[PDB]
Amino acid sequence: DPMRPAIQGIILDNIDGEGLDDFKEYNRNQLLISGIAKPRNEKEQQIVQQAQMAAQSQPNPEMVLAQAQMVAAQAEAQKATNETAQTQIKAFTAQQDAMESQANTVYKLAQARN
Amino acid sequence: DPMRPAIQGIILDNIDGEGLDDFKEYNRNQLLISGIAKPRNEKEQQIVQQAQMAAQSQPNPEMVLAQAQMVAAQAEAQKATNETAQTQIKAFTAQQDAMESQANTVYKLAQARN
């Protein structure tokens, strides 16, 4: 369950003595980019948290790229959804031309009697 | 959890005695290329850290190459999204030619009476 890493992060944020500034800063960065620390409105809310929001929007193209194999199919089906209808339109045009040719050949039978 | 390697790296950065210069330097390199050491603004922030930023941008083509199998499909679908519409345009052109031929063959029926 998620819990246990969060409990360890909170514990390590407290405690500690000499020579642990870099380690504690590294811990707090991961603790606050995961929505557990509640930035205290000085620098991280606008620097590392905003970068975290960008990196939340950053890998959406990356992950849909791993899911674009059925997005190329989405696009192909979406366009074929309107392209093949040209065949219905062509059939309608051919029916109109058939009516024309019906009139024309009736006239042809009218003329050939002379 | 990540933690444990970071704790070991921090521990090994401290301590140590005679004849451990190369090992400690090798450890510190991996310690700051992973964003835990905070370069102390002398040489590494501009030499190895910049190279690591480049090597962060370096393998993006390498990894999307492992994900380009559905990027060739992206490109093919994207172009077919505008190429097949030539069939709709051709159907429109054929309809225009059909109405022209309607007028032309009506004229043909007009002339053949003499």
Secondary element (H or E) of residue B7: helix B3-13
> What are the tokens at A24?
């504690």
With beta carbons less than 8 A apart as the criterion, state whether A8 and B24 touch: no
With beta carbons less than 8 A apart as the criterion, state whether B32 and B38 touch: yes
**Resolution attained, angstroms:** 2.8
Report CA-CA distances (Å) from A100 to A33, A87, A96, B5, B62: 73, 20, 6, 83, 62
Q: Which residues of A touch B98 (CB under 8 A)?
A: 93, 96-97
Query: Number of residue pairs across A and B with CB atoms under 8 Å?
Result: 84
Smallest CA–CA distance, residue A79 to chain B, in Å, is 6
Q: DSSP per residue over B41-98, as a string?
A: SSSTTTTHHHHHHHHHHTHHHHHHHTT-HHHHHHHHHHHHHHHTHHHHHHHHHHHHHH
